[PDB]
Amino acid sequence: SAFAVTQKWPAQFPEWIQLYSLPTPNGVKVSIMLEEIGLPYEAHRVSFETQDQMTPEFLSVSPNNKIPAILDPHGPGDQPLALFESGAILIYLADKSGQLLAQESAARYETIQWLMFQMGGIGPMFGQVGFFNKFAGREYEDKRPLERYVNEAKRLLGVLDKHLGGREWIMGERYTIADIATFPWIRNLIGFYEAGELVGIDNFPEVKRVLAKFVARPAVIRGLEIP
Amino acid sequence: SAFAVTQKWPAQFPEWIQLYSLPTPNGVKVSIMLEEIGLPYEAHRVSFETQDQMTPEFLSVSPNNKIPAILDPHGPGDQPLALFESGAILIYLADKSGQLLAQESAARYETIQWLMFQMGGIGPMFGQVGFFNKFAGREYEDKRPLERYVNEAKRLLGVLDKHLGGREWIMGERYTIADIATFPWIRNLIGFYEAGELVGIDNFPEVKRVLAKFVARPAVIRGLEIP
Numbered sequence: 223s224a225f226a227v228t229q230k231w232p233a234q235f236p237e238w239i240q241l242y243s244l245p246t247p248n249g250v251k252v253s254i255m256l257e258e259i260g261l262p263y264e265a266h267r268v269s270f271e272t273q274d275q276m277t278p279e280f281l282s283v284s285p286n287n288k289i290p291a292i293l294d295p296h297g298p299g300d301q302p303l304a305l306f307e308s309g310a311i312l313i314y315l316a317d318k319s320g321q322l323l324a325q326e327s328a329a330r331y332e333t334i335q336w337l338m339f340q341m342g343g344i345g346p347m348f349g350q351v352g353f354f355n356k357f358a359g360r361e362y363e364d365k366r367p368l369e370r371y372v373n374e375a376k377r378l379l380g381v382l383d384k385h386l387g388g389r390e391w392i393m394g395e396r397y398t399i400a401d402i403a404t405f406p407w408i409r410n411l412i413g414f415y416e417a418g419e420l421v422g423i424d425n426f427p428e429v430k431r432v433l434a435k436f437v438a439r440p441a442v443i444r445g446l447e448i449p
Numbered sequence: 450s451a452f453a454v455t456q457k458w459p460a461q462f463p464e465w466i467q468l469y470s471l472p473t474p475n476g477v478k479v480s481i482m483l484e485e486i487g488l489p490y491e492a493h494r495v496s497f498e499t500q501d502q503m504t505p506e507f508l509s510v511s512p513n514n515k516i517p518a519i520l521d522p523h524g525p526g527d528q529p530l531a532l533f534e535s536g537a538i539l540i541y542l543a544d545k546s547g548q549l550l551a552q553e554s555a556a557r558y559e560t561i562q563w564l565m566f567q568m569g570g571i572g573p574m575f576g577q578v579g580f581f582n583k584f585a586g587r588e589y590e591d592k593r594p595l596e597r598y599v600n601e602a603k604r605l606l607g608v609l610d611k612h613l614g615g616r617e618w619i620m621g622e623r624y625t626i627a628d629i630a631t632f633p634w635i636r637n638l639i640g641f642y643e644a645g646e647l648v649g650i651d652n653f654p655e656v657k658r659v660l661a662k663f664v665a666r667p668a669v670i671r672g673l674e675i676p
């Protein structure tokens with residue numbers, strides 16, 4: 223470790239996966255993942271209040287200045303590996319543990335398909351609802367932006383609600399990385415963002431059903447508070 | 450084929466990959482991909498003007514009511530496979546052709562990492578610039594939303610510009626699915642969306658360099674017009 227990132231977050235456990243994150247919907251995706259697959263890891267809180275995500279040290283593992291990011295001392299070829307983007311980390315950790323993602327077949331690509339649905343739709347659009355309802359955008363007088371993203375959030379929820387009808391999880395019977403990527407965001411929309419009534423969350427009983435099942439998993443319960 | 454989608458888009462070539470798309474940044478990702486890897490396919494134009502993406506036939510392969518989507522008659526286990534989400538289709542077609550994505554190692558996960566950067570950042574945020582500069586959002590008097598997404602587009606471009614410094618493509622020497630996912634959007638931002646001056650695109654010479662190289666690839670040139 224002659225690496226820059228460890229100058230701010232030194233590894234007490236320099237053999238385990240290093241986690242640079244914060245209990246946000248995108249961050250808990252990865253901590254939940256690690257808890258679910260039983261891989262040993264060390265967690266470091268990246269504080270936004272002190273702008274830790276803008277430091278050159280953090281930028282060396284995540285040039286996008288965003289959490290989560292990992293640094294696996296024992297990546298492929300037992301060489302160290304840095305990664306950012308929650309979805310990429312999910313796929314990586316799935317491959318490495320052989321868990322929560324089918325090895326091939328139609329099911330693998332359908333799982334990635336729903337993961338992309340979250341990455342390009344759920345995450346970014348719910349994020350906009352948060353800006354316009356919880357943060358600086360709350361004060362904008364023209365409420366058409368808020369309505370645009372509430373309506374998009376409703377459309378996405380309905381797509382997911384229709385899909386979950388008759389299924390235990392997103393991929394039917396098997397719990398997968400798709401669930402791990404999706405439900406922390408639904409949780410955040412109706413909790414921290416206070417948009418539950420706004421998007422009419424009770425109108426999506428299937429989404430609520432699976433969310434309820436998600437947060438009752440002990441691994442999930444741990445991961446939600448980490449770090 | 451007792452499938453619903455083929456009731457509106459019947460396959461002249463019922464042995465080749467079926468492409469339901471439209472020359473949009475997300476659509477050309479997949480047509481460019483298919484042209485680059487030399488896989489035979491058939492293209493069907495999904496017209497938004499007639500709301501073809503809302504028909505039950507389209508929804509059976511893409512429940513999110515969005516293009517691109519494919520239907521591969523000969524997917525895994527020589528069973529038919531439907532997929533939506535451009536990024537998922539890119540990874541699928543990469544695996545199937547053994548092209549444009551490393552089989553493993555650090556490079557594979559770093560490629561997916563940059564693909565996720567596009568999926569969750571570039572695509573959704575440039576899309577918002579288009580709404581507020583080209584479409585209905587253009588007329589909103591409060592210009593703070595437009596500025597929010599222009600500024601985010603600038604931040605993303607700078608992340609990418611810093612990264613491309615000294616590299617031939619996103620993954621350095623090798624042209625990958627990351628380039629195929631990213632540059633159709635940069636092209637669209639400064640072409641169709643007319644936001645080139647708005648985001649100050651000349652300030653990102655590396656991005657412009659690689660974009661120039663991208664659109665001079667013949668496969669890319671074909672794919673941009675398809676269907």
Ligand SMILES: N[C@@H](CCC(=O)N[C@@H](CS)C(=O)NCC(=O)O)C(=O)O
Binds near residue numbers: 247275287308
């Ligand atoms: N597409 C990215 C999004 C990551 C992201 O948005 N992280 C937020 C917290 S949930 C962040 O780090 N914000 C810090 C900043 O933008 O300054 C991913 O899935 O990892």
Ligand SMILES: N[C@@H](CCC(=O)N[C@@H](CS)C(=O)NCC(=O)O)C(=O)O
Binds near residue numbers: 246341344349350
């Ligand atoms: N401060 C920036 C970043 C705030 C931020 O990163 N929010 C996260 C949620 S905590 C987000 O929207 N991520 C979008 C995604 O995951 O795609 C902003 O105003 O957008």
Ligand SMILES: N[C@@H](CCC(=O)N[C@@H](CS)C(=O)NCC(=O)O)C(=O)O
Binds near residue numbers: 475534
């Ligand atoms: N995350 C999706 C985004 C797909 C997407 O946004 N498609 C647009 C065209 S580029 C669309 O089909 N719009 C139709 C609609 O929303 O009604 C992907 O990458 O495939």
Ligand SMILES: N[C@@H](CCC(=O)N[C@@H](CS)C(=O)NCC(=O)O)C(=O)O
Binds near residue numbers: 342473474
């Ligand atoms: N009409 C819808 C959909 C329009 C649409 O699908 N735009 C595409 C570009 S043509 C987009 O923004 N895709 C976002 C992405 O790829 O993540 C809207 O106003 O957002």
Ligand SMILES: [Cl-]
Binds near residue numbers: 332
């Ligand atoms: Cl599915």
Ligand SMILES: [Cl-]
Binds near residue numbers: 559
């Ligand atoms: Cl990299």
